[PDB]
Design a binder for this molecule. Sequence first.
Ligand SMILES: CC[C@@H](C)Nc1nc2ccccc2n2c(C)nnc12
Length: 113
Amino acid sequence: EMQLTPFLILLRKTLEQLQEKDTGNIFSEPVPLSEVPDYLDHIKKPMDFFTMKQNLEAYRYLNFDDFEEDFNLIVSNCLKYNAKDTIFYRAAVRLREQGGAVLRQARRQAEKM
Ligand SMILES: CC[C@@H](C)Nc1nc2ccccc2n2c(C)nnc12
């Protein structure tokens, strides 16, 4: 029960904060299926920050849970696809931790709306 514009402004800011936590930009764009040809054999729904931005501006995120669900896919896909002893796997663990704090704060501000 809130206004659409301030909510989208908040998701835009939150998405920028999450992208800032991904310092290697390894989640900024879709996993290049031509460089990882078996990726879609394992990953039911790829997700990345660029796609999240397009979804945001297409009005696909009208509540905080749908935004956070796609962030969680970025993390879970990476944990699933990559072995534990890799930089990619540990980067998804770090993003889960650092991103989770960004999301809790942003969700509090959405609840103020
Ligand atoms: C051996 C498969 C590894 C290299 N997987 C990934 N490669 C990526 C390459 C470019 C951008 C993202 C990539 N990625 C992500 C995200 N999760 N796993 C991989």
